[PDB]
Design a protein around this ligand. Structure first.
Ligand code: HEC
Ligand code: HEC
Ligand code: HEC
Ligand code: HEC
Ligand SMILES: [Ca+2]
Ligand SMILES: [Ca+2]
Lengths: 376, 125, 354, 376, 125, 355
C-alpha cells in the first residue's frame, strides 16, 4: 500500500535527518530479469518516439530510450542487449533521411553500436514486432524492406556493419530460426523459408498454402523463438500454429479461440498486439470483444486463455479497461501485460487469476507495443 | 462513441471521423491542418502511392472507391486524428492496408507522415 | 442526316479510290476486324504500316480508332499542360482536321492533291448523290469543299456507337451486370492505386461518365528507338522523333519527346505497343515501367530481346515525378494488370483474346 | 453558425453531384494579412516542436511549420517572410548539435534560406519572443547567447550568412530600433543601447537605471517596433513604458494595471505572454487574476485593458478559460488572442467587447507563444 | 488543485508537484523516469550548472537551499511534469530563473532537457 | 589533560629550540598574526618559506593551520577517490603523523634526527614536568617516545578552538546574527550554483555541521610551475611536482598532478595562492577558472603578468568534467565571489582585510 514515491520521501527524509551523504550521479538500471517489460510509443506517427523500460514487479519506469520515426525495437532473449532500427531526418521530418541500428547496453542504456543502413532501406509502417528480428545467436539483425519490393536486410551486430539486402518473393514478416535461416509469410498463403550465406542469392523454399485467400491473418502474430512456435490468429479468432523447432514448418491442428456460439454473437479478436504466447506453460492469450467485423483495430476488454496443445479454454478475463495490446512475462506465475493506447497506461495483471496488480501511466502519446525477454 | 460498434457514415462534416469518405483512413484529416478534403497543406509533399477502400455514401446510396494519399515531409499534424478500417486487410494485402506509410512518389523523397486526403477515384466493384 | 453524314463516312472509310493507285482505304490500315489497327506484316513486323505505293513504311505505329471520338480538341489547359487532339504527337486539332492527312501523305494513301481526291469522288454516282444531298449541289466540283466534306463525313462516322460501344467486361462490371474474377479485380485495384491511374484515367478524381483510360495529356516515358521500324521508315538513323514539339506552333522545348497518352481500351488486341510499335507483348509494355522503380538487374532488360531496353530517343522531359513511384510490380501484379487490361476489350473483340 | 467542416462537406457533395473535377495538389496559404496569427508550441521542452499558422478571422489552421528544440519564431511586420532560429541533434536529443536559421515563404511555407549558426550559439530557454529579433528593415536577425557569456549573434538574412557575435554587458533580451542598433535590459536596472558594425567593438551606452532591484520585470514584455514602444510589466502589474522612437530611451510615467484595492485583495498578472500592446489604439492588455505572489506563471482568467497615455482602465474582460498568453491583431477592430496551454486551444475574442468569437483547438502539446505581424 | 493558490509543501511523496523540494522545479521529476530524487536516469547526462531556491521543509520547519540540476541528452520524459516558481525571478537574475535549460557542463555536451533532480546544498541565507 | 595536552603543544608551537640553529618555530612559518601562514619575503616573495638555515627555500606555499583539524585522516573512499590527510599532496595521514616532519626536514627546521629533538626537550625543565605528567617518567630519555609525544601535543593544540573558531561573518549570518550585503549574498549564490560548490563544499548534498569549504579530495586544476619559487627551491628545471602520486604507496598514474582541495576559510588573508604560491591576488585565483570556460582572449592571460597562464606542470588528469562548466564568470560575478570569500575570514583577522 505505501507507494514508490512515498517510500522515496521517507528514505530521503531519513538521509537528511541522519546526515547521510550521497553523490548525485547517473543511475544504472537493475539487471535485466523475467519481469522487465518494454513499452514502445510510436506516438501516432510522430517523427520522434520513446521506449519505456519498466520493472513489471514494482510497476516502475527504470529507464527510457529515444527513437526516431516508427522505430522497430528488439530485445535479446538472454538479457544481454536491446536494440532498435530507427530513422531520422536532417531537419526534423524533412531533408536527408538516415536509417540506422543502435544497440544499447541494457543497464547503462548507452549505445554500444550505431550502424548506418545504406539508402534509407527501412519499411515505414505502424509498429509490427516481426518486421525486425534477431537471430537466436543474437549476432544478426534482420529488418524488412517494402520499397521498391519485399526484401530483407542483414545487419552484422558482432562486426557492427550492414552486410546486404536479400531479394525475396511477395512476402511479409521475419521469423528467424537459426543463425542463417528465417521464415516469412507470403501473399499466396504459404510460408517461405529463406536460408542465407554470407554471400549468394538465398535458398528459398515454400511450404504448402495453409490458409485460404478469404481468411485474414493479423499483423501481430506471437512468435517464440525459443519454442520455435508461431501463433497466428485470424480476424475471426481461428488460431494457426506452426512448429518451426525442427528447422522446417510443421502445421499443427488449427484451434478456435472463440466458440461457434460467441462468433455468431459478434465476438472477435481486436486491437494491436492481440495475441500472446507463454512458452513454459504452452498457453495462448487472446484479446477479444463483441465488435463489428471491420472494427478489428479497436481496443478489447476481455482476454481468453487456452491450452495450445488441445485448444481448450482455460479462462476468460474481464480486463476492466480498454486494452489494445497484450504480452506475458516468460517466467513461472507470469504477469499478463495489458497496454491501453488511449489511457497511455500499462496495466499489470496476474496471468493466472487475471486480477490487476498495479499499473504504470503517462507512457508517451500513443503507446502500442510491449516486448519481453524470454530468459529461461 | 461506442468504438466497437459498426461504423455509421455521415455526409455533413469532413472534419469528423465518421465522414463517409474516411471509412479506411489512418492518421489525420488534411482539412484540419490547412489542406482540404482532397488537397495537401502548404509545405508538405503529396505522395503518388495510395491505399484503397470502398466507402458507402449515405447521401446517394452508392459506393465509391477512395484512394487515400498521404501528405508527407512534416511531423504528424496532431489535428483531427482518426482510425477507421472498413474493408481494411493485413499488410500482405497492401493495396487495402492502412498502417503502411504511403509516402512513395512524394516530391523530394518526403517520407514522414503529416495527414491523409480522401479523393474519390471510382465507383466500387 | 447526322445519321446520313455518318453513313457517307462509312462508305468513304472502306473505299480504296481515295488512294493514288486504289490499293488502300482507311480500313486497310485501321482494320475493323482488328479494333481498327493494322494486321499486315511489313519490314518491321507490325510496328509500322505500308502505304499505297507498296514500299513506303511510316515511322509510327497505326493506332486504334475506337474511342478516338471521346478525345477533346487540342488545347493548353490552365495548368499549362497540352491536352487532346489527334495523332501520337497531337499535330491535328480534332478528327475532322485529321481525316484529310492520310489521303495526301505520300507514305500513306499518297494522293497528289485535294483536286485528285475530288476527281475520284466526282467519278462515283453514289458519292454525287450522298454528298450533294448533305452539302449542296456542286460540292464535288470544288476541290476544297469536296475534301473538307469528305473529312467531315469520316469524322462523323468515327463518332458513331460502332467505334465506341462501351460493351467491354469492364463496362458490364461497372453497370453491375457481372463481377471481375479475383485476378481481374486485383489488377483493377493495382491499376487505380499504382502510378498507371495518374495518366491512364480521364479525371484526376471523381468518376468519369465514359472512361477511356487516358487523361489526353502528353508524356515522354523515355522509350528507345525502334531500330527496325526506324530503318523501314527511311527517315535516316540521324532522325529524332520529337513528338508534340513537332506540332506546328508548339515551340516550347519542354514538349520534346512527349506523346499523347493512348486510351487502353482494346489494348490487349492492338499490339505491338507504344508510338513506334517497339514492344510486341502487352506484358513487356507493362514491365517497361519497372525500369524506373525496380532495383533487380532483370528490370534493365527487355525480356523480348534479353538486351538492355536502350537509351531514350529523347533524353529530356521524362515524366520522372510520375514514373519514379518507388514501387516495383512483382510478377503477380504484372499478371493481374494484364488480366485487368484484357477486360477493356470490346465485346466483339473477345474472340481475339485467344 | 455552419462550421468549416460542414461548409466543406456541403461543397464536396455539390462537386460530386455536379461531376466537377479538381486536381489533388499542394495548397498555398492565403496571402498574409492583419488577421493571420502564429501559435508556437514549445511542447514542454520536447526535442521537436510545431508552429501553427492561423487565419484569426475564420478561426482556421492554414498551415504549420516544424521546428527543433525550443526554436525562436519571428514574423516580418510587412508580411514578406517568417523565420525561426532552431536546434537539432544527429540522434533525436543526443549527438552533434546544429543550430540554424530558416527563412520561409509566407504562402508556400517552403524554406527560402537555411543558415548554419557556428559553434551551437543559441540560448536554450523556454520561449521568449524578444530573445530573437528582426531589425526594422527585415535584413538582419539578432539572437541571444547566454553561454559562455551574454552575447548577441548577427545573421545577414539578405546575404544568407551568419556575420558575428557581439560581446555585451550582463544584459538580456534584444529590442531592435535601427538596421544597426538595439536595446537590451541589464541586471543593474538600466537599458543598454548597442550600436554595432561588421567588425569592431560595438558602441554600448547605458541609460539611467529605471527600476529598483526588488521590482521584477517579466520575461515577456511587449515591444512594438513600429511605435518604438517597450511596455514592461512587473510582477505586481505596475507597467514601465519606454519610448525608443527617437533612437534613444525616454522613460514614460509608469502606470498601475490594477487598483490599490485589487492589489490588496491579491490581484496580480500571471501567465507566459502576460501583456499585449495595440499600436494604433495605444492600448495595453494585461492578463491578471487573484493569486499568491509566487504563482506568476499560472494561467489567468481576466484581461484588463488600459489607455497607455493616461493609465485609465478601459475594460476588464472575463475570459471564461485558463489563459496563459495574449496578443492582439494590429488592425482596426482588432482581435484579442487568448491562448490556453492547458486546453491547447487559441480563443479568439473581440478586443473591444471581450466576447469570445471562435476558437482553434488541438494546437500541439503545450502551445505558449502568439505572434502577429504589424502590417499597418 | 487551485493553481493560483499559495503553494503548500508536503514531505510524504516525492512524485507529487507539491513535494517540498520541488518548490522551483520547472520540467519533470527525475524519479519518474528511472532516476531518483537526487540521481539521473540511465543514459542521461548530469549537468553541472544549477538553479537555486530556498524551499521550506514542513518536516523540520527549516528552509533549505535546493540547487536543481538537469539530466540532459534525452527528449523530455513526459512523466510527472511540474512547474513551481517559489522565489523564482526573471531571466536577468539567472541563478533564480527556472525557464533556462540548465544543462551546462553535462558530459558529451548534452543540452536537451529530460528531467530535474532536487538535491539540498545548504540551509537558507 | 585534553587541556594539558593542548597546553603543552601551545608551548612547543612557539619554541625555536626545535630547530637546528634555534632560529625557527612552527609559528615562524605559521604566524598566528597572519592566519597561521608565513609573512616573511624570500627569493620568491611570499610563495615559499625559508628554512632555519636562512637559505633553503621549500617548493610549496606554506598553508594555514586554521581548520586543518577538521580534515579526515587519509583514506580511499568507495568512489575510488582519495580523501583527507595533511600536506598539499596528502603524504601525511593526519595531524599527528604530519607534526614531526618539519622538525626533521633539512629545508625547514633541519634537526638531524629524533635524538637531537629529544636532547632539546630534555634541556628545558618545563618540558620535563609537562611531558612526564602526560606521558610518564622517562619519556624524554627515549628519542622515539619523546618525538611521538611532541607530535601528539602539537596535533592536540591544532585541534583547539583557537585554530578553528567558526566566528567569520559567514558563520554569524548562518546563525541568524547578521545578514550578507547584496554583493556578498550574490557571491554566495554564485559559489553554490557554479562549479566552486563541486570541490569547495564539504558534502555532495545535504548540510554540513562544520563547513570548511573543501571536500578534502585531490584534483589537478592544471596550474603552471611558479618559476621563481621553483628556481628558489633548487629542485631543478626538470623536476615535476606530482602531487598525490608522490605520497609513498600511491602508484596510480591517474593521481599525478593532484593536490588536496584547500579550505577557503581565511583565504582572503593567506595569499599568495595555490600549492606553489603562483597567484598574488585572490581575484587572479578566481579568474584562473575562466581559462576553462571563457572564449575571450583575456581569459587565457594572467592579469598579474600580461602573459598566458602557462602550460600545466602536469598536463594529464585535469578535472575537466568539473572545470569545463560552460559558463564564464563576468566581472560582476568575480566581484561577488571576492566579496563572499572575504566573509570566510575569522573575526580576529577582519582587520587584516583592508591591507
Ligand atoms: C498507311 C496506313 C494508314 C492509312 C491508309 C490511314 N491511316 Fe490513320 N493512322 C496511321 C498512322 C501510322 C497513324 C499515326 C501517325 C502519327 O501519329 O503520326 C494514324 C493515325 C490516325 C488517327 C489518330 C488516332 C489517335 O489516337 O491519335 C485517326 C483519327 C486516323 N488515323 C484516321 C484515319 C482515316 C479517317 C483514314 C482514311 C482517310 C486513315 N486514318 C488512313 C495509318 C494509316
Ligand atoms: C507518366 C504518364 C504515364 C504513366 C504513369 C503510365 N503511362 Fe502508360 N503510357 C503513357 C504514354 C504517354 C504512353 C504512350 C508512350 C509512347 O508511345 O510514347 C503510354 C503507353 C502505354 C501502353 C501501350 C498502349 C498502346 O496502345 O500502345 C500500355 C499497355 C500502358 N501504357 C500501360 C500502363 C500501365 C499498366 C501503367 C502503370 C504500371 C502505366 N501505363 C503508367 C503514359 C503513362
Ligand atoms: C620553514 C617553514 C615551516 C615551518 C617552520 C613549519 N612548517 Fe608547516 N608547512 C610548511 C610548508 C611549506 C607546508 C606544505 C608543504 C607540503 O605540502 O609539502 C607546511 C604544511 C603543514 C601542515 C599541513 C596543512 C595542510 O592543510 O595540509 C601542517 C599541519 C603543518 N605544516 C604544521 C607545522 C607544525 C606543527 C610545525 C612545527 C613543528 C610546522 N608546520 C613547521 C612550512 C613550515
Ligand atoms: C575541480 C575541483 C575544483 C573546482 C571546480 C574549483 N576549485 Fe578552487 N581549488 C581546487 C584545488 C584542488 C585547489 C588547490 C589547487 C592547487 O594548489 O594545486 C583550489 C584552490 C582555490 C583557491 C586558492 C586557495 C588557497 O589557499 O591557495 C581559491 C581562491 C579557489 N580555489 C576558489 C575557487 C572558486 C571561487 C571556484 C569556483 C569558480 C573554484 N575554486 C572551483 C579545486 C577546485
Ligand atoms: Ca499498337
Ligand atoms: Ca597561501
Amino acid at each position: 500500500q505505501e507507494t514508490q514515491g512515498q517510500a522515496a520521501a521517507r528514505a530521503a527524509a531519513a538521509d537528511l535527518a541522519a546526515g547521510q551523504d550521497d553523490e548525485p550521479r547517473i543511475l544504472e538500471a537493475p539487471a535485466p530479469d523475467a519481469r522487465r517489460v518494454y513499452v514502445n510509443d510510436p506516438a501516432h506517427f510522430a517523427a520522434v518516439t520513446q521506449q519505456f523500460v519498466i520493472d513489471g514487479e514494482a510497476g516502475r519506469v527504470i529507464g527510457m530510450i529515444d527513437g526516431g520515426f516508427l522505430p522497430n525495437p528488439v530485445v535479446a532473449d538472454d538479457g544481454s542487449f536491446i536494440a532498435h532500427a530507427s530513422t531520422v531526418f536532417s531537419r526534423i521530418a524533412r531533408g536527408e533521411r538516415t536509417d540506422y541500428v543502435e544497440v544499447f547496453d541494457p543497464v547503462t542504456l548507452l549505445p554500444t553500436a550505431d550502424i548506418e543502413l545504406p539508402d534509407a532501406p527501412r519499411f515505414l509502417v505502424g509498429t509490427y514486432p516481426w518486421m525486425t528480428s534477431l537471430t537466436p545467436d543474437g549476432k544478426t539483425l534482420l529488418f524488412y524492406q517494402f520499397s521498391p519490393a519485399p526484401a530483407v536486410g542483414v545487419v552484422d551486430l558482432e562486426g557492427k556493419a550492414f552486410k546486404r539486402m536479400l531479394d525475396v518473393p511477395d512476402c511479409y514478416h521475419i521469423f528467424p530460426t537459426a543463425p542463417d535461416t528465417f521464415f516469412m509469410h507470403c501473399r499466396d498463403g504459404s510460408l517461405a523459408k529463406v536460408a542465407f550465406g554470407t554471400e549468394g542469392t538465398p535458398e528459398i523454399t515454400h511450404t504448402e498454402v495453409f490458409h485460404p485467400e478469404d481468411e485474414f491473418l493479423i499483423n501481430h502474430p506471437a512468435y517464440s523463438q525459443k519454442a520455435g512456435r508461431l501463433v497466428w490468429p485470424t480476424y475471426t479468432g481461428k488460431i494457426h500454429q506452426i512448429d518451426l523447432s525442427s528447422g522446417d514448418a510443421k502445421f499443427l491442428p488449427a484451434v478456435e479461440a472463440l466458440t461457434e456460439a460467441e462468433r455468431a454473437d459478434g465476438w472477435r479478436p481486436g486491437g494491436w498486439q492481440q495475441v500472446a504466447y507463454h512458452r513454459a506453460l504452452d498457453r495462448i492469450y487472446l484479446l477479444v470483444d463483441q465488435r463489428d467485423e471491420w472494427r478489428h483495430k479497436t481496443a478489447s476488454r476481455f482476454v481468453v486463455v487456452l491450452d495450445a496443445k488441445t485448444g481448450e479454454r482455460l479462462a476468460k478475463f474481464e480486463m476492466g479497461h480498454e486494452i489494445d495490446s497484450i504480452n506475458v512475462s516468460q517466467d513461472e506465475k507470469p504477469l499478463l501485460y495489458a497496454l491501453s493506447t488511449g489511457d497511455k497506461t500499462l496495466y499489470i495483471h496476474d496471468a493466472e487469476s487475471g486480477e490487476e496488480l498495479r499499473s504504470v501511466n503517462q507512457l508517451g502519446h500513443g503507446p502500442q507495443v510491449i516486448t519481453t525477454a524470454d530468459m529461461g | 462513441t461506442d468504438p466497437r460498434a459498426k461504423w455509421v457514415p455521415q455526409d455533413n462534416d469532413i472534419q469528423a471521423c465518421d465522414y463517409w469518405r474516411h471509412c479506411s483512413i489512418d492518421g489525420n484529416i488534411c482539412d484540419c491542418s490547412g489542406g482540404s478534403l482532397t488537397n495537401c497543406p502548404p509545405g508538405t509533399k503529396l505522395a503518388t502511392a495510395s491505399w484503397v477502400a470502398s466507402c458507402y455514401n449515405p447521401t446517394d446510396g452508392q459506393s465509391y472507391l477512395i484512394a487515400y494519399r498521404d501528405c508527407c515531409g512534416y511531423n504528424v499534424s496532431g489535428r483531427c486524428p482518426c482510425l477507421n478500417t472498413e474493408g481494411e486487410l493485413p499488410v500482405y494485402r497492401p493495396e487495402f492496408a492502412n498502417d503502411i506509410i504511403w509516402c512513395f512518389g512524394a516530391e523530394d523523397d518526403a517520407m514522414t507522415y503529416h495527414c491523409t486526403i480522401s479523393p474519390i477515384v471510382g465507383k466500387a466493384s | 442526316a447526322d445519321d446520313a453524314l455518318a453513313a457517307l463516312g462509312a462508305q468513304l472509310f472502306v473505299d480504296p479510290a481515295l488512294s493514288r493507285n486504289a490499293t488502300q482505304s482507311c480500313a486497310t490500315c485501321h482494320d475493323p476486324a482488328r479494333a481498327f489497327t493494322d494486321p499486315r506484316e511489313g519490314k518491321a513486323g507490325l510496328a509500322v504500316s505500308v502505304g499505297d505505293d507498296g514500299q513506303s513504311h511510316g515511322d509510327r505505329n497505326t493506332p486504334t480508332l475506337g474511342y478516338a471520338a471521346l478525345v477533346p480538341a487540342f488545347h493548353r489547359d490552365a495548368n499549362g499542360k497540352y491536352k487532346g487532339g489527334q495523332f501520337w504527337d497531337g499535330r491535328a486539332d480534332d478528327l475532322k482536321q485529321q481525316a484529310g492527312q492520310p489521303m495526301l501523305n505520300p507514305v500513306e494513301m499518297a494522293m497528289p492533291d485535294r483536286a485528285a481526291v475530288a476527281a475520284r469522288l466526282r467519278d462515283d454516282p453514289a458519292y454525287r448523290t450522298g454528298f450533294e444531298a448533305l452539302f449542296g449541289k456542286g460540292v464535288l466540283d470544288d476541290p476544297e469543299r469536296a475534301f473538307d466534306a469528305a473529312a467531315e463525313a469520316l469524322a462523323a462516322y468515327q463518332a458513331t456507337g460502332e467505334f465506341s460501344p462501351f460493351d467491354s467486361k469492364y463496362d458490364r462490371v461497372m453497370r453491375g451486370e457481372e463481377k471481375f474474377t479475383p485476378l481481374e479485380e486485383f489488377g483493377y485495384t493495382v491499376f487505380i492505386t499504382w502510378n498507371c491511374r495518374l495518366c491512364h484515367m480521364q479525371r484526376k478524381q471523381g468518376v468519369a461518365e465514359r472512361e477511356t483510360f487516358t487523361n489526353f495529356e502528353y508524356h515522354n516515358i523515355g522509350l528507345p528507338v525502334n531500330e527496325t521500324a526506324r530503318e523501314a521508315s527511311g527517315l535516316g538513323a540521324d532522325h529524332v522523333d520529337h513528338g508534340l514539339l513537332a506540332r506546328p506552333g508548339i515551340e516550347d522545348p519542354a514538349q520534346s519527346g512527349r506523346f499523347k497518352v493512348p486510351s487502353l481500351r482494346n489494348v490487349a488486341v492492338t499490339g505491338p505497343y507504344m508510338h513506334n510499335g517497339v514492344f510486341t507483348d502487352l506484358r513487356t509494355a507493362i514491365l517497361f515501367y519497372n525500369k524506373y522503380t525496380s532495383r533487380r538487374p532483370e528490370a534493365k532488360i527487355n525480356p523480348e530481346t534479353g538486351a538492355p531496353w536502350g537509351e531514350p530517343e529523347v533524353a529530356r522531359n521524362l515524366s520522372l515525378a510520375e514514373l519514379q513511384s518507388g514501387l516495383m510490380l512483382d510478377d503477380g501484379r504484372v499478371d493481374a494488370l494484364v488480366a485487368f487490361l484484357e477486360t477493356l476489350t470490346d465485346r466483339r473483340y473477345e474472340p481475339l483474346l485467344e
